[model samples]
Target: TPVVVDIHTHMYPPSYIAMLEKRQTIPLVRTFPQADEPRLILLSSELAALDAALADPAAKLPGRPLSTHFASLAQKMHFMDTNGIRVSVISLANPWFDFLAPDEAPGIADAVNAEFSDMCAQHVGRLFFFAALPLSAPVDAVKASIERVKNLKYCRGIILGTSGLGKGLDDPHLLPVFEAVADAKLLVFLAPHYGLPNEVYGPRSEEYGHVLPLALGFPMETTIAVARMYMAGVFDHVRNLQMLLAHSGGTLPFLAGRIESCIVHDGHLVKTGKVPKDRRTIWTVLKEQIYLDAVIYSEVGLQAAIASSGADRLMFGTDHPFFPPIEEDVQGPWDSSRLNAQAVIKAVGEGSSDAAAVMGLNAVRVLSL
Candidate 1:
């Protein structure tokens, strides 16, 4: 039997949490008398809440509680065991090193990455980490950080946010950093942070309970970032770059056929011959260079993701700590986690060979466990 594995898990080391505590910005931490734990607010969507919280302590806690599950190794292992996850390629949670001053970024990155390395070292086979880079620092500093992480015993790759060097992943300046990362044999775990502008969701976003941001915004951001990277030829320029897209390629699988159709129909691309007759399509790129996490919560979504990127390229993930059961027992199996697991079983059928691959074997092979 193939052991279950989760690749989209996160941790906020003690030091990183402390750093967020001191800041007064969107990523800051705040405590409320009503909540047991300090709220770990770290999204662009939370900007309004930050102001409201500062003005009135009564404002319903802005973000999710910063539970022990986020920073404790013991909690991580327990969550894994409870969920039947035999292995996990953990990475630092979002907004990593993107907010640091240029002078302070590299050193803090080294410290955080080293902390992750030490944690994984203790767990050995059960744990591995994708280090965080200091994008706010100079290009050379970023390159050096990649080299430093590459030599770490359990460093598998780096977790990256959508904003690449401030201009997004399509920026020409980011290509060299991408090349350096590829040369180091590091996989790029692309996650989202700056979701779509608030306007796209219309004026009634507050009524939705983080679902729009988590379910829709995050995936859409990933799709746009990767699409921009494709349009900019980043993949072609950096041949060895390997990427793991969070949330089943962030609607990419569902939107791929549309994207391809749009590219061919666009007057600018057609006239400029940028859409070459022989060029690799998004589907080809997904199969060859991209991996998707089976984090989509429904069978319909999971089947689409599997069809877009084969089951061999899909890996199971729980996204634990972030999406605990809303009304159910938190100690029991998380519904958020089980939704993904159930998706796999439903899409490929329970006990099927392909289901086993999506649940664990594929992750073990891809991450070389």
Candidate 2:
């Protein structure tokens, strides 16, 4: 039997928490008297709550609780054991070095990456980590961080947010970093932070709680980022750059065929000869260089992801501690975690070998664990 593994879990180490504590922005940490753990608010959608909390501490707290589950290795092990995960490739959660000032970024990134390395060191074979980079810094500094992290003993890859040097992932300036990472043979785990501009979700978005952002915005952001990179020919330029897309390729699996069609039909690309007769398609790039996490939370979504990316490229994940049980029954297994797990079983069947691969073996092989 293949071991069950989770590749998208997050941790907020002491250093990271301290950095967030000092921030005054969307990704800051706040403590409320009523909440046992200090609340960690990171989403762009939480701007209202952030203002309200700062204006009136008496108001309802902004984001999820900053429980020990987020930082403690013991809690991570327990969650893995409880949920049957044998190995976890943990990464620091979103808004990593994006919040740092241009001058402050490199040092902070070093500290954060070192903290991740140290955390993995404590657990030996049970844990591995994806290091974060100071993307806001100059290109040289960013490239240097990649070299630094590649040498870390337990560092398997890197966790990257969608914003690549402020102009988004398509920016030409980001290519050097991408090249360096590929040259270092580090897999890039692309996650989302700056979801769409909020207006895309319609006027009644507040009524949807966190569902709209988590369910739709996140995946869409991932899809757009990767598409932009593809348009820039980053994948073709750096052939060895492997990536794991969070939220099941952020709807890319479902929209890949459409993306290829759009590229072929694109007047600008066709006129510029960018869409050549021998060009690699989006579907080809997805299967060859990209891996998708089975975190779509629905059987239909998972099947589409699998169909688009192939079952062999799918890996399981639990966005743990971020989406704990909202109901009073906190002791029960998390619906968020179960949704992804059930997706594999429903899409591939419970006892199927394909299910086993998506649930763990794929990650073990891809990450070389």
Candidate 3:
């Protein structure tokens, strides 16, 4: 039997939670009279609700509940056992150090990373982590954080948001940071936290809850960020840089052909001598430099991801603590996690080597677990 590995699990250290609880901003954790658990307000879309709740104590809560699933190591272990996950490479959840002040980011990064290292030490062979960077700090500080995490025993990579140093990943100034991470041989777990402008969802978006943003906005943002990086030749510049893209490369596999067509046919790019004949195609990068997590919920989506990036490059991920069953028992296997597992089996026939590879062996081999 293959050793089942979950490569995309997340956590929020208790210390990090305490820091958020003390803040008066969107990322803060607050207790509401209506809810038993403290609410974690991270997205800008929740600002209106947060303000309303602060002004009127009787209003509906803002953001999701901050539960032990986010901060408890014991809960993570129980979750792993229940799901038959043999190994978990967890990371600090989204919005990691992204909102921290420049002066405070590096220190907090050190502490949070140390926390992850300690957590992994408790589980030994079963747990590892991807450290978070202090991207809000100065370039040298960011480089230092990479070095700090590199020396950490259980850190296999760094969890990175789409936003890089206030600019997007394609920003040229962020090149040195990427270079340092690549030199340290750390995989970048690219996530989509800041989706497109909330206005794009239309005025009636509030009626739809978070469905539109979670389903559409997140993946679209991931696609756009990677496309921009490709356009800016970031992949070519950082040849050793490896990234594990969340949400199965976020519509990238499906849209690669269209992106390729647009690139070749654009007169401006051709005339400006930007489109080199020997340039690496998006397809090449997807195959060579990128790894996709099988977190997409459908077999159709998983198949597209596998086709775009080979089965060997695809890894299983539970996305734990983010999509827990809202209406069902928290101890049971979540539908969100089950769907992804089922997709992998459906995309590649059950009991096949490819299925086994995607389920665990790929992650074990890729991350050297």
Task: Find the candidate with the highest lDDT and give its number.
Answer: 3
Q: Which stretches of candidate 2 lie over 4 Å from their true place?
A: 24-26, 32-35, 41-64, 328-332
lDDT of every model, 2 decimals: 0.88, 0.86, 0.92
TM-score, every prediction: 0.92, 0.92, 0.94
Q: Could you report the Cα RMSD, in angstroms, for every candidate shown?
A: 2.5, 2.5, 2.0
Candidates, ranked, TM-score: 3, 1, 2
Q: Candidate 3 vs. truth: CA RMSD?
A: 2.0
Model 1 lDDT vs. the true structure?
A: 0.88
TM-score of 2: 0.92
Candidate 2 residues 77-175, lDDT tens each?
A: 887877778899999887788878888999998998898888888888878989999988999989888888998888999999999888888888888
Clashing residue pairs, backbone N/CA/C < 3 A, model 3: none
The window of 10 residues in a row where model 3 has the poorest summed lDDT is 25-34
Q: How many angstroms is residue 197 displaced in model 1 relative to the true structure, after the best TM-score fit? A: 1.4
Q: Pick the candidate with the highest TM-score.
A: 3
Residue-level error in angstroms, candidate 2, position 257: 1.4
The residue-by-residue lDDT of candidate 1 on 1-369, one tens digit each, is 688889999999877888788887767787766677888887778878767876887776787778878988888988888888888889998878898989989988998888888988888899999999999999999999999999998888889999989999999989999999999888899999788887887889889967787777898999999999988889888889999999989989998999999999999999999998898898999988999999988889888988888989998998777888879877778888888999999899999989999999997888787
Kindly list the per-residue Cα lDDT of model 3 for residues 192-311, writing each as its tens digit: 998889899999998998899999999999999999988999999999999999999999999999999999999999999989899899999999999999999999999999999999
Can you give the lDDT of residue 288 in candidate 2? 91
